[PDB]
């Protein structure tokens, strides 16, 4: 994602954990590639020493979404930055709002 300063590319899960833990701040976050599915990404959010990781995918229409619980209204975003902006807001269904970007 060339326009997403928090995108670290194909770093390992544990590398991402260590980058977030170095900040020591709940609400720190980054993006990295999925280790499991080509072209999927992981939004990684620090809270209380654990990295809450939300899989983010693009549709054939170009929109982006995060993995959502069964029965919950799933949200689609035109661009990654719009997903990020939405999840900066209080009380949106992730562990803590996205507050402290860990820039590559």
């Amino acid at each position: 994602m060339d326009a997403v300063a928090v995108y670290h590319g194909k770093i390992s899960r544990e590398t991402g954990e260590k980058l977030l833990l170095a900040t020591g701040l709940d609400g720190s976050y980054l993006l990295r590639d999925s280790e499991s599915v080509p072209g999927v990404y992981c939004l990684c959010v620090l809270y209380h020493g654990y990295i809450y990781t939300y899989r983010v995918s693009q549709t054939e229409t170009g929109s982006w979404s995060a993995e959502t619980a069964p029965g919950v209204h799933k949200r689609y975003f035109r661009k990654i930055k719009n997903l990020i902006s939405a999840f900066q807001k209080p009380d949106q269904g992730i562990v803590i709002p996205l507050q402290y970007p860990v820039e590559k």
């Binding site: 939300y54 995060a66 992730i94």
Partner: peptide, 11 residues
């Protein structure tokens, strides 16, 4: 013993 918790959006 992983520090990563795969999670889903809840709202």
């Amino acid at each position: 013993k992983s520090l990563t918790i795969y999670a889903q959006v809840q709202k």
